[PDB]
Structures are given as C-alpha cells and as structure tokens.
C-alpha cells in the first residue's frame, strides 16, 4: 500500500506518527519501509518494534478485558461478548501474523550481525508468545514450540556474541523468562534465567560508560522486579 512512497519518507513519517501517538499509522509506515527490501538500521529496527508493540499492546489489553467479561458470564448474556472477543482475537492474530511475515520475508534471513539477528529472533519469539496467549489446545502446543525455538536461537547467539550487559541480550532474557513463567508453565526455569542473567550482568557493569550503565541497569531492574513478584 506504501509502494509509491520513498523509503526515507516512510521512515520520517513513522517518526512523526510516534510523536503523534498514531501507532497504527506508524506500523503501516514501517511495514512499507521493510517491504522496500533493504536491511534496517538499528534505529529503524527500534521504530518497527515500537510501532507493532503498541498496536498489539492495545489489542492484548482489549482481549484481556473481554476475556475476563466472557469468563464471568459463563445469566444468558447472548453471544455478543464471545463474538466480540473473537473479533478482537482475530485482529490480534492478524497483526502477529503480519509481523511474523515481515520477519520471515526477509528480515531474519538477511540479518548476519548479532545485533540484528538477535533482535529479530527475539521479536519472532515475542509475537509467537502473543499468539500463544490467545491459543487453545493443540494449536497452543505448536505455537509455544515456535516461540521457544525462536527465543532459544536468539539466546544461543547472544551468549556467544554479546556481553552480558548488552541491552538486547538483557531484554531477550527478560522476555524469555516471562515466556517460561506465563506461557510454558516453567516458573523455576523463569526464576533461574532471570537470576543468572542479573548476576552475570552485575559482574560486567564495571566495563561500561555512564550512559551504557544507565541502559543496562534499567533492564536489570525489570529482571529484579519480576524476581520479586515470583519469589
């Protein structure tokens, strides 16, 4: 749909849409930029992630509100709560499928540096995780496996190629721990991963500048916040 707009104009409009809190527009601009076929820079990857995180975040919040109402209802409330929850769920699944499709065509296969490849594989794990949040039954099993596989490949690369304080490595470990706790019914694995990630980052903080220290410690605090809730 964005095929007639210059790549650089799509990126500039994505930045404007972020400032205007127009995240659906932002995601459409960034989809158009990806579909130009060139690799994305560090900041362009961040724009892609912010746009879709906000779109799917609104959908997830709405799905949770509707699911809670539906669970309460089961007086006959009619089919409306279920029908509307299903509508939101289908829309959410479509956004996740769109993001996964961008990663598969062709962002991951062209990503050779650790920073880009880990970033995209973490996104792949995240969007399969959002699919898993709404999935049921055997569908849930294969979706869960797909999230786990993406996160595991990202973890393997990050441990070989990035320092333990790298913010992408830290955020990957945070989100994989949430996967273990909330999706995979593995709270002990979640706690172990968060603890080991925190401790290994702590021991590497001495190597960092003031600005990098702030970036890494911010994410470490999120690991600690989860550990406080889980223990």
């Amino acid at each position: 749909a964005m095929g007639s707009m210059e790549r650089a104009s799509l990126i500039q409009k994505a930045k404007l849409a972020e400032q205007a809190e127009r995240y659906e527009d932002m995601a459409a601009f960034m989809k158009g930029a990806v579909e130009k076929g060139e690799e994305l820079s560090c900041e362009e990857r961040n724009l892609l992630s912010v746009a879709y995180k906000n779109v799917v975040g609104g959908q997830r919040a709405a799905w949770r509100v509707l699911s809670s109402i539906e669970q309460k209802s089961n007086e006959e409330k009619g089919p409306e709560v279920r029908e509307y929850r299903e509508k939101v769920e289908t829309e959410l699944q479509g956004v996740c499928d769109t993001v996964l499709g961008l990663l598969d065509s062709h962002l991951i296969k062209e990503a050779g540096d650790a920073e880009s490849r880990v970033f995209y594989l973490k996104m792949k794990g995240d969007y399969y995780r959002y699919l898993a949040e709404v999935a049921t039954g055997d569908d849930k099993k294969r979706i869960i496996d797909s999230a786990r596989s993406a996160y595991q490949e990202a973890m393997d690369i990050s441990k070989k190629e990035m320092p333990p304080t790298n913010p992408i490595r830290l955020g990957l470990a945070l989100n994989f721990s949430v996967f273990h706790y909330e999706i995979a019914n593995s709270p002990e694995e979640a706690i172990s991963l968060a603890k080991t990630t925190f401790d290994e980052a702590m021991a590497d903080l001495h190597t960092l500048s003031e600005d990098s220290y702030k970036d890494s410690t911010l994410i470490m605090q999120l690991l600690r916040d989860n550990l406080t809730l889980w223990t």
């Binding site: 809190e21 992630s49 912010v50 945070l174 949430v178 989860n226």
Partner: peptide, 9 residues
Amino acid sequence: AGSIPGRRS
C-alpha cells in the same frame, strides 16, 4: 510478570 515495555513518545 513484566516483559520489556515500549519506549515512551
């Protein structure tokens, strides 16, 4: 609990 949040703007 909490995953990485989006940055604010």
